[PDB]
Each structure stands twice: as C-alpha cells, then as structure tokens.
Design an enzyme around this catalytic site. Structure first.
Site, short mmCIF file in Angstrom:
data_model
loop_
_atom_site.label_atom_id
_atom_site.label_comp_id
_atom_site.label_asym_id
_atom_site.label_seq_id
_atom_site.Cartn_x
_atom_site.Cartn_y
_atom_site.Cartn_z
N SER A 63 0.97 -4.38 7.93
CA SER A 63 0.09 -3.78 6.98
C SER A 63 -0.88 -2.74 7.57
O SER A 63 -1.06 -1.65 7.04
CB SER A 63 -0.68 -4.88 6.32
OG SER A 63 -1.72 -4.39 5.52
N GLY A 65 2.63 5.32 9.89
CA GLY A 65 4.03 5.49 9.63
C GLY A 65 4.83 4.23 9.88
O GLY A 65 5.99 4.11 9.41
N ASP A 107 -0.10 -7.48 0.43
CA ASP A 107 0.33 -6.20 0.94
C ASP A 107 1.85 -6.15 1.02
O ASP A 107 2.40 -6.14 2.09
CB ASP A 107 -0.30 -5.78 2.26
CG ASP A 107 -0.23 -4.30 2.51
OD1 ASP A 107 0.39 -3.66 1.58
OD2 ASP A 107 -0.84 -3.74 3.39
N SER A 112 3.61 1.30 8.83
CA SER A 112 3.30 0.47 7.71
C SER A 112 4.57 -0.05 7.02
O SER A 112 5.51 0.69 6.97
CB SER A 112 2.67 1.39 6.75
OG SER A 112 1.32 1.06 6.66
N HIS A 164 0.84 -1.19 0.00
CA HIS A 164 0.00 0.00 0.00
C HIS A 164 0.89 1.27 0.00
O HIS A 164 0.53 2.38 -0.34
CB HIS A 164 -1.11 0.06 1.12
CG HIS A 164 -0.56 0.11 2.47
ND1 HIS A 164 -0.26 -1.05 3.19
CD2 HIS A 164 -0.19 1.20 3.22
CE1 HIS A 164 0.24 -0.66 4.34
NE2 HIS A 164 0.29 0.66 4.37
#
Ligand SMILES: [K+]
Lengths: 51, 185
Positions: free
Chosen positions: B156, B139, B63, B141, B33
């Site tokens: 994710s 942040g 992801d 992620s 993403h």
C-alpha cells in the site's frame, strides 16, 4: 502543488511523477512534498511529469 | 502478465497484485488507492493494450481493489514473476516476505508488526495493516507481498526508499479474497 499540509508520516506508492528543482523526478506528490519539507523549504517544483 | 508487472490507469502507474478468479471469471487485485477513480487499465504506457476494468475498490480504511479482465488474448499467469503462488495465508510477526513491484523489482524482508494503523492524511486512514522492513517506491503500489508460494498482501505505502531502507505496509490479501469471493489460481 501545495505542501503546507506536510510532512506526512507515510505516502502511498503510486506513480505520477513531478520534476523537482534538484533535477530529480519525484514519483509522486506526497513524496515530492516530504522532500520539500526535509529540505526545509529549499526544493521547488520545476514541472509536472519526469525531469 | 503476472504479479508485480506494471499497470496503467488514466491517472498514473501501479503494480498488478495477484491474478485471481471466480468460476470462469478472471480478475486481478491491486491497491484500492490505485482502483479509486479509475475505470480502465492498460498493460502499457501507450495505453494500446487493454487489460480490463475496475469492479470494486475499497480505499481508504482498506487498501484493495479488483479489476475484471476484458482482454481475451492476454495470458493470465497465476504467478509472481515466474514464482508460483498456490495459496493465500495470514501474515505473522517474523515471517520472511518478498515484494515485487513495477518500479523496484523484488525486495525481501520480514513482517515486524500486525494490525498497523497508516494515516496518509486528509482522512485517508487505513487500518489492520501489515508492517514490514521491506522497501517500496512510487509505482510499486498494489504489487504482491508473498512468502514462498504463499500470497500474503498488496503493497500500500510507507516511507523510506530502497537505497536508504524503509518501511512498507501491506493489506492482508485474505481480506480481499473474501470480500470478492475470489481465489488465487
Ligand atoms: K516508499
């Protein structure tokens, strides 16, 4: 930002902050809109970027 | 630059997952993403230090995304913070795991479930995800999920935060390693 589609059970953890009316920086739109819902419509967007 | 450190794209901030490589080609995995719609990746908010450019991105459904390093000077440690990572491995219910992310630092917890379906909305559904009781915030992620010296997944999303506690879903990193034909080092 439109929060009508919210709430959402989950949010990705990417950072693109928004500044809410409670003076708190929301790390991202999904996070911000879920808070707007949880406040039952009382929280608003002050501006994009950090507070 | 290692696992967990910040990474910046044109759109916002993410966390670097793991340093990987094929042959003599270095890359780094992170969240799809975050790789979706990005091209260039910098090591700082100032965007003065280039890291590399997007090479693949799979999101939604999966992801994970991969970035090819174009920076020649940057050191590419095969660590998580200064935690040595020497292998990849499948998550298991009950496993003790630790996450590292650019916004929250390191937090640990356990795997509570496998094959979880995560629906982020508006057709962005991801499947086969690891569920844990580990927290994460914006942040973080794409940051690494590990166990000892084992790479387990990439951050994710989820709900909750680190103050109140939450739930965080990760993409099995084995999946990404195979798709790209890379390996941890
Ligand atoms: K979260």
């Amino acid at each position: 930002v439109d929060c009508s589609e919210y709430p959402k059970p989950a949010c990705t953890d990417e950072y693109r902050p928004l500044c809410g009316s409670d003076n708190k920086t929301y790390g991202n739109k999904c996070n911000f809109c879920n808070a707007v819902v949880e406040s039952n419509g009382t929280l608003t967007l002050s501006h994009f970027g950090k507070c | 630059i290692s696992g967990g450190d910040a990474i910046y794209s044109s759109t916002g901030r993410c966390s670097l997952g793991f340093n990987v490589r094929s042959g003599s080609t270095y890359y780094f995995l992170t969240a799809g993403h975050c790789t979706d719609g990005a091209t260039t990746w910098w090591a700082n908010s100032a965007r003065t230090t280039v890291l590399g450019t997007t090479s693949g991105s799979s999101f939604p459904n999966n992801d994970y995304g991969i970035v090819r390093y174009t920076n020649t000077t940057i050191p590419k440690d095969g660590t998580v913070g200064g935690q040595d990572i020497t292998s990849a491995a499948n998550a298991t219910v009950g496993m003790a795991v630790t996450r590292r992310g650019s916004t929250t630092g390191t937090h640990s917890g356990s795997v509570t479930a496998l094959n979880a379906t995560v629906n982020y909305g508006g057709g962005d559904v991801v499947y086969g995800m690891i569920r844990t009781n580990v927290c994460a915030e914006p942040g973080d992620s794409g940051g690494p999920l590990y166990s000892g010296t084992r790479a387990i997944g990439l951050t994710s999303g989820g709900s909750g935060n680190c103050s109140s506690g939450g739930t965080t879903f990760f993409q099995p990193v084995t999946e990404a390693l195979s798709a790209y034909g890379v390996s941890v080092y």
